[PDB]
Coordinates of C-alpha atoms in Angstrom, one line a residue:
X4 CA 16.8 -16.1 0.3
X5 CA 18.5 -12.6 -0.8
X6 CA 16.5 -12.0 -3.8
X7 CA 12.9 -13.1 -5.5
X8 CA 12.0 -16.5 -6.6
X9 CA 11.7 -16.7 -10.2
X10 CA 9.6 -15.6 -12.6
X11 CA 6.4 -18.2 -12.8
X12 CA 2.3 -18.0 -13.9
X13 CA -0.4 -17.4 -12.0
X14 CA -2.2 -20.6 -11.6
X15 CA -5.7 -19.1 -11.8
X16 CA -7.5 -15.4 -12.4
X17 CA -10.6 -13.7 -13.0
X18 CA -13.2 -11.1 -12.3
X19 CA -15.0 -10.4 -8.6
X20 CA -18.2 -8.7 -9.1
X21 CA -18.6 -6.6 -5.5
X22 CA -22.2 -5.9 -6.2
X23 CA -22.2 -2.1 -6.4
X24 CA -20.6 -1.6 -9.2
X25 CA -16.9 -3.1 -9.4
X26 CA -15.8 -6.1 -10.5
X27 CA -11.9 -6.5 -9.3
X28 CA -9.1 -8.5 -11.1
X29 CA -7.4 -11.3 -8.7
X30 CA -5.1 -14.0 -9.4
X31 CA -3.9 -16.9 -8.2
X32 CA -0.6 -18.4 -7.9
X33 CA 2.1 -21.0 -5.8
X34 CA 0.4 -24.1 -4.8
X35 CA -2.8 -24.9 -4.9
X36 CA -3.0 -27.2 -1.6
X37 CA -0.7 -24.8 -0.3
X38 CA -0.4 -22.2 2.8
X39 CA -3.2 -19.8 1.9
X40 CA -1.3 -16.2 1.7
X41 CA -3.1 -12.9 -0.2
X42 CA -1.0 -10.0 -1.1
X43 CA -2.3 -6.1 -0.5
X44 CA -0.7 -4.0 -2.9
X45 CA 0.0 -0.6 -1.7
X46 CA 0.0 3.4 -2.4
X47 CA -3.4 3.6 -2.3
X48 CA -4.5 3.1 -6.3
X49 CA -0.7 1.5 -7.5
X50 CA -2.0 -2.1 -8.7
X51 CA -0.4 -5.7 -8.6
X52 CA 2.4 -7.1 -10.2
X53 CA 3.8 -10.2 -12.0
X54 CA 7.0 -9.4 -9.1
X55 CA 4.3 -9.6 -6.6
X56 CA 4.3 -13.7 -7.2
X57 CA 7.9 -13.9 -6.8
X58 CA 7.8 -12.8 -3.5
X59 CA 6.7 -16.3 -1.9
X60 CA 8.0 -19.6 -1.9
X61 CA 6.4 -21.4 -5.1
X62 CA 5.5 -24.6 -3.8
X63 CA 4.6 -24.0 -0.5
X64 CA 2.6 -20.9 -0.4
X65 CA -0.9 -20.6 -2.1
X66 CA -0.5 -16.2 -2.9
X67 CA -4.0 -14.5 -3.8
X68 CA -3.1 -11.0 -5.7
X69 CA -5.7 -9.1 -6.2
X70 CA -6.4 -5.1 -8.0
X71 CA -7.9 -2.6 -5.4
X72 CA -10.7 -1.1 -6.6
X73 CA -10.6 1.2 -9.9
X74 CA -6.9 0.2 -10.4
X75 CA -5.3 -2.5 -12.2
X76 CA -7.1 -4.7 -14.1
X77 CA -10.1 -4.3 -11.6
X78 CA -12.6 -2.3 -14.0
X79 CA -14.1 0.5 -12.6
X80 CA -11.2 2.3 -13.9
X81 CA -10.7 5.7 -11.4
X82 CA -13.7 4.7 -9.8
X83 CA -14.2 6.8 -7.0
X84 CA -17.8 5.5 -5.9
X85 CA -18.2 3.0 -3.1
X86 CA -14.1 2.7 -3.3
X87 CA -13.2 3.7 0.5
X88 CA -11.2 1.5 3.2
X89 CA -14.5 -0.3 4.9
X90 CA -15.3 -1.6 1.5
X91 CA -12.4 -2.8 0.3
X92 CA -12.0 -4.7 3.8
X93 CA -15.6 -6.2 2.4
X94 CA -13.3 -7.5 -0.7
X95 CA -11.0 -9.1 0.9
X96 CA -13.1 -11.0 2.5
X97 CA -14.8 -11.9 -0.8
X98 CA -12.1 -13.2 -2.1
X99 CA -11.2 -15.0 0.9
X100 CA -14.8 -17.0 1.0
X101 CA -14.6 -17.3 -2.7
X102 CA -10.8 -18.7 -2.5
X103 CA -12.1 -21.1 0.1
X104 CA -9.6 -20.5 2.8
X105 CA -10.8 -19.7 6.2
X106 CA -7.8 -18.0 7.7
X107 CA -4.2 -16.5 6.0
X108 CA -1.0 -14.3 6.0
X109 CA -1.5 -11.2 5.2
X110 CA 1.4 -9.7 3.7
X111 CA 1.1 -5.9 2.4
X112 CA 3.1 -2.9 2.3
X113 CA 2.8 0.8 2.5
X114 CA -0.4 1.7 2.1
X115 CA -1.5 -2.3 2.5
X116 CA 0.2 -2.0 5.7
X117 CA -2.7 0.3 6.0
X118 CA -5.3 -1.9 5.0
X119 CA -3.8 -5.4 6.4
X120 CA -3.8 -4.0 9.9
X121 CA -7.5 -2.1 8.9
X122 CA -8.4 -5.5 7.8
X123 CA -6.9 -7.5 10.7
X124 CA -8.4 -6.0 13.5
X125 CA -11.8 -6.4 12.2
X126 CA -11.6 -10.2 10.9
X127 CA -8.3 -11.3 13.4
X128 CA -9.8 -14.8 12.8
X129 CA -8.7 -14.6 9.4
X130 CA -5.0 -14.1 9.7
X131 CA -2.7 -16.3 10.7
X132 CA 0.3 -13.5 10.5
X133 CA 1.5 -10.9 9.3
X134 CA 4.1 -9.1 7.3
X135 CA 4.1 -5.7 6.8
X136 CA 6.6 -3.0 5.4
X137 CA 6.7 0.9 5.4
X138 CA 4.1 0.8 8.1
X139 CA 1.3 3.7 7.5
X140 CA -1.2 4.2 9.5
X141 CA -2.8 7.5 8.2
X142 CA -2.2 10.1 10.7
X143 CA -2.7 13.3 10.2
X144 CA 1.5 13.9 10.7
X145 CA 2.1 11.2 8.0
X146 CA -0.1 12.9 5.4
X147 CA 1.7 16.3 6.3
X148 CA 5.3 14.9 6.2
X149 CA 4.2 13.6 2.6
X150 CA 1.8 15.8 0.9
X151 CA 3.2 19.6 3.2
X152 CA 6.1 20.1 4.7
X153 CA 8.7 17.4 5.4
X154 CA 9.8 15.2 2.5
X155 CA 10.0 18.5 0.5
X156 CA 12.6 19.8 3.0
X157 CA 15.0 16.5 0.8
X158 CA 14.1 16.9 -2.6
X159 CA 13.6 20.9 -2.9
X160 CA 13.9 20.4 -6.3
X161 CA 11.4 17.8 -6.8
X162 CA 8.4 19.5 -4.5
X163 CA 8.9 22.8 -7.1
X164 CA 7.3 20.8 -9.6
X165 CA 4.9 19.3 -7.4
X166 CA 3.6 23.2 -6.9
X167 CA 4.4 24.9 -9.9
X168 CA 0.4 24.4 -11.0
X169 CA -0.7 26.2 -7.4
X170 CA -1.5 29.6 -6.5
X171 CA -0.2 30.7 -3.7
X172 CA -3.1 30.5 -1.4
X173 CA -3.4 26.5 -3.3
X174 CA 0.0 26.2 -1.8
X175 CA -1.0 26.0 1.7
X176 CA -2.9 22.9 1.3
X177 CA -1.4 20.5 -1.8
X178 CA -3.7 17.4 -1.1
X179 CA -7.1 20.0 -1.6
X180 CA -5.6 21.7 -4.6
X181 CA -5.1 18.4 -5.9
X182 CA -8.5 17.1 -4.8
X183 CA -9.8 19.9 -6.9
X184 CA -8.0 19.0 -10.2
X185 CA -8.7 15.3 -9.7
X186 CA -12.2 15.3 -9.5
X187 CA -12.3 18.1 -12.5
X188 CA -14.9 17.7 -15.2
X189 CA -12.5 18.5 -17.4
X190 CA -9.6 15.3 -17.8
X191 CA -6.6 16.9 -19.3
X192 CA -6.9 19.2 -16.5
X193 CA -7.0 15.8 -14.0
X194 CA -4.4 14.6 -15.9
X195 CA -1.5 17.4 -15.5
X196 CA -2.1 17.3 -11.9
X197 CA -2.4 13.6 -11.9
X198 CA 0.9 13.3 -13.8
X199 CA 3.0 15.5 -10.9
X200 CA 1.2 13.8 -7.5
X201 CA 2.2 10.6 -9.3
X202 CA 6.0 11.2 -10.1
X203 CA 6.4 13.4 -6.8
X204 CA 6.4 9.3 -5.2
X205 CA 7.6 7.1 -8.2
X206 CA 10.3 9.9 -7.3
X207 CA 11.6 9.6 -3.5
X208 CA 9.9 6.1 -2.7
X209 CA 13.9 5.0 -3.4
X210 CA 17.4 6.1 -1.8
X211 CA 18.8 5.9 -4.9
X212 CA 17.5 7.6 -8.3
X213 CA 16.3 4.5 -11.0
X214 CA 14.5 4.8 -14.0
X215 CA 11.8 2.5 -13.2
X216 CA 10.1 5.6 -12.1
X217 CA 8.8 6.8 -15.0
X218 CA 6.5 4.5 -14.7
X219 CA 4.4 6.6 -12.5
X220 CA 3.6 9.6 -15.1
X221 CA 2.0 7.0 -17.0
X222 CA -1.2 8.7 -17.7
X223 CA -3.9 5.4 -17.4
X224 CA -1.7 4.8 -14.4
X225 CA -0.9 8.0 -13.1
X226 CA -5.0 9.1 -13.8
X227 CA -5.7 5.9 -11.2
X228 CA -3.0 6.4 -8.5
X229 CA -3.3 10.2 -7.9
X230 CA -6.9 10.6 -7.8
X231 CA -7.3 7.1 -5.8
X232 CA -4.5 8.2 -3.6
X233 CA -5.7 11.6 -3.1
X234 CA -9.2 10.7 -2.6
X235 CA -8.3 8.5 1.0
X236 CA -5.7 11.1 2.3
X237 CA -8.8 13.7 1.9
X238 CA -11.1 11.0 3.8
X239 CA -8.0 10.4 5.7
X240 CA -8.2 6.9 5.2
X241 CA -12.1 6.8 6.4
X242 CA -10.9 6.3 9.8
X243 CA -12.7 8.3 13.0
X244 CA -9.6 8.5 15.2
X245 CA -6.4 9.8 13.8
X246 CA -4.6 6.8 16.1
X247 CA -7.6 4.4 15.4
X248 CA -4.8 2.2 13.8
X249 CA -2.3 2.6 16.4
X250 CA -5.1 2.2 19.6
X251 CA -6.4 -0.8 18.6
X252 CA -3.4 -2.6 17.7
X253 CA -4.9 -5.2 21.3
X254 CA -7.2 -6.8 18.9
X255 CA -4.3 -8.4 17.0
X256 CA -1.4 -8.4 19.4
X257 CA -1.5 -12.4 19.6
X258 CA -1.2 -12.5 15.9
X259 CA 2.6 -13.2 14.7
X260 CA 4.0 -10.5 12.4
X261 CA 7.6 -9.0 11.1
X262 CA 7.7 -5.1 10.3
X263 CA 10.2 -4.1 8.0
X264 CA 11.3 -0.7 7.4
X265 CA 14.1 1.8 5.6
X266 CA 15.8 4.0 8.0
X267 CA 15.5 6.7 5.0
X268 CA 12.2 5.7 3.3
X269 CA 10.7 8.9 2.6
X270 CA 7.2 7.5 2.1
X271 CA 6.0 6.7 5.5
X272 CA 8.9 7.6 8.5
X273 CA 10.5 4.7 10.7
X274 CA 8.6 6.9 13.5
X275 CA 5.4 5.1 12.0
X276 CA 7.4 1.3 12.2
X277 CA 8.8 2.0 15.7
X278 CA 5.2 3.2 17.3
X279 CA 3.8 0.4 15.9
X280 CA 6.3 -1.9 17.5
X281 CA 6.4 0.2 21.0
X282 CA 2.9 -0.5 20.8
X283 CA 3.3 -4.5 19.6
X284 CA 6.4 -6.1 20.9
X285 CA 5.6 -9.1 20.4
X286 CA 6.3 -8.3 16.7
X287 CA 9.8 -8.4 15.4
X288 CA 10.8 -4.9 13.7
X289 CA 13.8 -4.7 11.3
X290 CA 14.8 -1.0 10.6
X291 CA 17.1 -2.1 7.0
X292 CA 19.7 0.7 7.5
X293 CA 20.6 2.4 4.2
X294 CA 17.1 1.7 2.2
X295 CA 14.3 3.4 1.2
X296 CA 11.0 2.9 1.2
X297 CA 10.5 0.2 -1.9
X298 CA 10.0 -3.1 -0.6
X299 CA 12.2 -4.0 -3.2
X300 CA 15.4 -2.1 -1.6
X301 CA 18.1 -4.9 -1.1
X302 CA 17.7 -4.9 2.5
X303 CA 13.9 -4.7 2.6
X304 CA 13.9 -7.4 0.2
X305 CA 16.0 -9.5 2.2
X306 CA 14.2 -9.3 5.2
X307 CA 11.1 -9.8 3.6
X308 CA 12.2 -12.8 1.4
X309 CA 13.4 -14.1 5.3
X310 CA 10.2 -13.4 7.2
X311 CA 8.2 -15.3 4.2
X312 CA 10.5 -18.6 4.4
X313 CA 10.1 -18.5 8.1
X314 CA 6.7 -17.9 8.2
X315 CA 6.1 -20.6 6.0
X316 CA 8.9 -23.5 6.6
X317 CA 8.4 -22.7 10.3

């Protein structure tokens, strides 16, 4: 189809306790006996949605949605501690043993374009294939196009904001400045810079301008995002290999996948979707022309409502 199926409840939810100190929200929805599918929110920190269901056909797939790690629902509200990419990888897998399903579609964008392909080539037994969107794979020229010198060059405007709480000598590094702020002892501090990282994407994560993002100044939401966000660009992602993502995209090769992507998606660059696929041809890429980097553009959302039917009604 064009658009989302509709609306509809999640079937089953609850609590994972990880063991060091988080317990992290997950549902349940689409068919119990169904195709087993999990869903990896991205932007590192942004949590699930009740849209996120939509996204697969009803009764065919078997979707597991599940809140990161100190976002969403998932308690540890902001936590920081043990929250980093290897751990979360550990999560999935929880939830995988737990929901009983010994291999599954992994279908995540942005930043779970990160973490599905982080994921996937270190359990490729466990996915079946793979649909991802706004590729990221955190190199060192994605966090700068971002977070430095790039994006701003297209919203001028916007990035004033984004550095009117920096000194001059802050300004030649945003994502430390920020780091500082964010882990402040004192929260209304965290919170001012919290509020501006946060809008800055909820900003030009669109072609067009909406009003669904005010959503991201938020403060509960926008204390999550910005310090959860900031704290794995300053790890930079947790990875030791700037390409480790790209170079060791053999492991997974055999495994089917779609990569969608807006020509003007100002998140992550289509120069991240085409290496990917120069790397992978066996995958399937689909630049949308005129879309940004929301999955749910028109195009992207096309594309993505097309890979899913196929994937599943094969």
């Amino acid at each position: 189809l064009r658009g989302l199926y509709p609306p509809l409840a999640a079937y089953d939810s609850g609590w994972l306790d990880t063991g060091d100190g988080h317990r992290i929200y997950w549902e349940l929805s689409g068919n119990p006996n169904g195709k087993p599918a999990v869903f990896i929110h991205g932007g590192p920190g942004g949590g699930i949605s009740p849209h996120h269901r939509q996204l697969f056909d009803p009764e065919r797939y078997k979707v597991l949605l599940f809140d990161q790690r100190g976002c969403g629902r998932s308690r540890p509200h902001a936590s920081l501690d043990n929250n980093t990419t290897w751990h979360l990888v550990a999560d999935i897998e929880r939830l995988r043993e737990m929901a009983g399903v010994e291999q599954w579609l992994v279908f995540g964008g942005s930043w779970g374009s990160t973490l599905a392909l982080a994921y996937a080539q270190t359990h490729p037994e466990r996915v079946s294939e793979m649909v991802l969107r706004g590729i990221f794979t955190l190199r060192k020229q994605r966090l700068h196009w971002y977070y430095q010198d790039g994006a701003s060059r297209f919203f001028p405007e916007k990035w004033e904001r984004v550095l009117s709480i920096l000194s001059d000598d802050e300004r030649k590094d945003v994502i430390a400045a920020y780091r500082q702020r964010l882990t402040s002892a004192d929260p209304q501090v965290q919170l001012e810079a919290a509020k501006l990282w946060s809008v800055w994407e909820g900003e030009t994560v669109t072609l067009l301008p909406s009003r669904e993002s005010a959503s991201f100044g938020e403060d509960d939401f926008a204390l999550a995002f910005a310090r959860i966000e900031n704290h794995y660009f300053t790890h930079l992602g947790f990875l030791e290999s700037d390409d480790q993502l790209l170079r060791n995209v053999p492991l997974i090769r055999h495994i089917p996948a779609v990569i969608v992507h807006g020509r003007y998606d100002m998140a992550c660059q289509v120069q991240n979707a085409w290496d990917l696929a120069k790397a992978w041809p066996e995958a399937e890429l689909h630049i949308v022309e005129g879309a940004g980097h929301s999955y749910d553009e028109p195009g992207i959302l096309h594309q993505l409502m097309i890979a899913t039917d196929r994937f599943a009604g094969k």
